[model samples]
Target: LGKFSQTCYNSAIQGSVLTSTCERTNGGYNTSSIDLNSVIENVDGSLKWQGSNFIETCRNTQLAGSSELAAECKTRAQQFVSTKINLDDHIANIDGTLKYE
Candidate 1:
């Protein structure tokens, strides 16, 4: 979850492009939906980043998917990161081997 969640990823830095690697283990799945902060950056009413491609890239990398999330990406381009979105209604670590941040 690059630019997605604070808890799920770390050590994000620059590469030739970027090096936000996935975390090895996850904990605390006490929520139905997770809050993904900084998916887009807003500055002085101008946008610094928007995450349609990043989101898709995460999916292609992740399981190739997350559904309820898809709806948001499709309709809510530039949507604020702090807005709560479901893990496709998933229970995260409690749900399966796939771990999203």
Candidate 2:
């Protein structure tokens, strides 16, 4: 679950009004359910990545339980973690006392 959470976080983008527009005009009214877990905030103060492909791919691949697919997800998740660590290191370099909350 932690891996999935991190994967989803890394894959998400800031949300936008266009998504709301589609939800309202295309299928918002007809929607049977909504999952708030999909929402994420971007650095610019906008919400993004309403439905990330990476997250969906991770979920689907994990469920399939195929060795090849599992390997793919594992590879991606590992990459994501590595990238995050690198970013954290960069931030620390800029201000060693600062920490991400």
Candidate 3:
């Protein structure tokens, strides 16, 4: 997942929207869907990764608790113990940790 995550994370300003999924070293699988849409601007330049809007979107989707992505979210309940956002180590730690809540 990290490799996919890392791959997704690296891109131009236009196609920065990325998704990554893979089994982690510990616990269950880790899936990271990163949307760099926040960094978009005219003449735009942002090699940065932004997950703020994504967090909000995920929150709403999960709260609905339906559909494919939401269902997937519901299935993987409570396996993720760590909700730490590893921004500094930003090297493909994709799964945003939206576990069973």
Candidate 4:
């Protein structure tokens, strides 16, 4: 989502280009709205990393733990890795899957 989110942000604030690979059968374009945090919640419900994309760093920072916990951490990490965004700038009229860190 890092690349996707960047495109969303640029479109919202900087009036940047917005492109999609949707097929024509899907009506070419379908617009929807989503809170940035919702994606994080879906990926990592607890969000121990709190919108952070750098998962490996956080895992390395945590203390030793049971294998189960480690596995869970890895699960969350997989979804969040390389998917961070900065929500410092908010905008109206978002045209895609908008998100923030």
Candidate 2: misplaced stretches above 4 Å?
1-31, 50-101
Clashing pairs in 2: 13-48, 13-49, 14-47, 14-48, 15-47, 15-48
Q: How well does each candidate superpose onto the true structure, as a TM-score?
A: 0.17, 0.16, 0.24, 0.18
lDDT of 3 by residue, 1-101 (tens): 22343323222221334444555667666556554446422222112234323322222222121111221111222364756675455444348653432
Task: List the pairs of residues colliding in candidate 3.
Answer: 31-95, 32-94
Two-way lDDT contest, 2 vs 3, winner: 3
Give the per-residue lDDT of model 2 (tens digit) for 20-95: 1112334433212223334422323222455333333232222122111121222322233333345554454336
Candidate 1 Cα misplacement greater than 4 A, ranges: 1-3, 23-47, 50-101
Question: Tens digits of per-residue lDDT for model 1 on 3-98?
Answer: 434533332322112223344456433322232334533333332356323333232222112211221223334555566776667646756577
Would you list the clashing residue pairs of candidate 1? none
Model 4 segments more than 4 A misplaced: 1-10, 13-25, 38-101
Cα error, candidate 1, residue 36 (Å): 17
Model 2 alpha-carbon miss at residue 42, Å: 3.3
Global fold similarity of model 3 (TM-score): 0.24
| Candidate 3 wrong stretches, greater than 4 Å | 1-16, 40-101
- Whichever of 1 and 4 has more TM-score, that candidate is 4
lDDT, candidate 4, 1-101, per-residue tens: 23343222212211111223322343554433323322222244343324544233223222122111121233344444566765657644456756542
Model 4 accuracy (lDDT, Cα): 0.31
